[PDB]
Design an enzyme around this catalytic site. Sequence first.
Site, PDB file in Angstrom:
ATOM      1  N   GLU A   6      54.168  -1.586  37.651  1.00 30.91           N
ATOM      2  CA  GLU A   6      53.856  -0.183  37.350  1.00 30.91           C
ATOM      3  C   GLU A   6      54.156   0.145  35.897  1.00 30.91           C
ATOM      4  OE1 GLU A   6      55.177   3.663  39.732  1.00 30.91           O
ATOM      5  OE2 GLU A   6      56.528   3.370  38.033  1.00 30.91           O
TER       6      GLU A   6
ATOM      7  N   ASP B 250      58.395  -3.038  54.391  1.00 34.07           N
ATOM      8  CA  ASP B 250      58.470  -3.779  55.671  1.00 34.07           C
ATOM      9  C   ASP B 250      57.917  -2.954  56.822  1.00 34.07           C
ATOM     10  OD1 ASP B 250      60.556  -1.970  56.063  1.00 34.07           O
ATOM     11  OD2 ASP B 250      62.121  -3.466  55.935  1.00 34.07           O
TER      12      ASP B 250
END
Lengths: 226, 235
Positions: free
Chosen positions: B16, B202
């Site tokens: 980013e 996750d």
Amino acid sequence: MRYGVINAMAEEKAALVDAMIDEKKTTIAGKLFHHGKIGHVDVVVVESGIGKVASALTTTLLITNFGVDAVINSGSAGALGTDLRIGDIVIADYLAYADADARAFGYAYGQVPQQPARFKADTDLSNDLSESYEKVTDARLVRGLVVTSDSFIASNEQKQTILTHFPEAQSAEMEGASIAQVANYFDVPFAVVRAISDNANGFDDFIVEAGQQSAQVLINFFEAQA
Amino acid sequence: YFQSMRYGVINAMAEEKAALVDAMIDEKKTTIAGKLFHHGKIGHVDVVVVESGIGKVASALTTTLLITNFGVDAVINSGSAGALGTDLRIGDIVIADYLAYADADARAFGYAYGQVPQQPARFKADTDLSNDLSESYEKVTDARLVRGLVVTSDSFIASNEQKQTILTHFPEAQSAEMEGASIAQVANYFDVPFAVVRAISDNANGEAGMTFDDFIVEAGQQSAQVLINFFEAQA
């Protein structure tokens, strides 16, 4: 020499302010700083705020705006040390976070990643303050570990939980290690002093008297300097 | 320096940062109190990108330096975090409505669980900024968006025991991480609007998906595309 005193006890602030000559107040980012000479040394006093982030913000503003040569953080806290009682003085040698757990990646209990496991208080400054307490007071002084969290550690139960991780912890409170972390980042020597306000197994004018005593101790230390 | 709106991006994802810097015209690099700030123009706004640091004090310090040295109009804190919320899946994007401290307990003085004394019990993310970010996500990605509570502590939340403990106190918590509420606390103190965004790394059900190391590269690029869209939309 310019000392920053990061304060919590109102009677300590009043008395330090009273001792100042040529006080100059400045508000910066809404924090009120009192800047004056005590004896021949320059002193800046500011209230810590409560908790890790508030005290970290205070310390950051203090160092960046006044360029202090050292930080002294005085206050009152409860005992974890079984041998301590109300009125004992703990001068920290090391500080750590009471409940920070990143042990999944190999960090020590209490260590935040990218920080040292424990923060070391300045040996000289800590010793100097101990000598001042010995000269000015008849308090029992202890050197040892102080731990910090954003919880108020009220019960004996909460205390033993911390002691299972830090068997030699003397006191748990809410700003010391966060002030240390910022001072450490800026390479500014620091000391952390706590008047014990309750027994591990547990008061009228306590905070008042401890504030007054702390200010007397600090004034003695300042007045000793060249 | 000379655009009317200036956003701070308090960052932790390398791709980013790389993409936001690449997008900047007149990229500048300024070090203040040991912190590197990358700044320049994206679209018609100025953007200041700084690494958060890890944990509450480090991120508070970053946020303080950012606000006091750059006078940003708003702070955006983007990152990745694991799932607490039961239905959450890898690649889901949580845009916080609120931040709170996961384990700060001063109930003995009458405060709510999570509340630090003299602070609000929860910190309110800026409605308009957070909405604008959600619209950019909808425009340029097909990610599932979630809006809700993110919680913060100086622990890494890994075991089912740690997760269940937080959920007992905050049944609606979507994720637990290490900088959100501390950044929020400082932004709130300075009356600077903030947003907190976390890409979920996750699956809440424990099912197998891509490695964290592959995910974080995808997540960072995606976040930058979203932010670039947002900045170029402000005109």
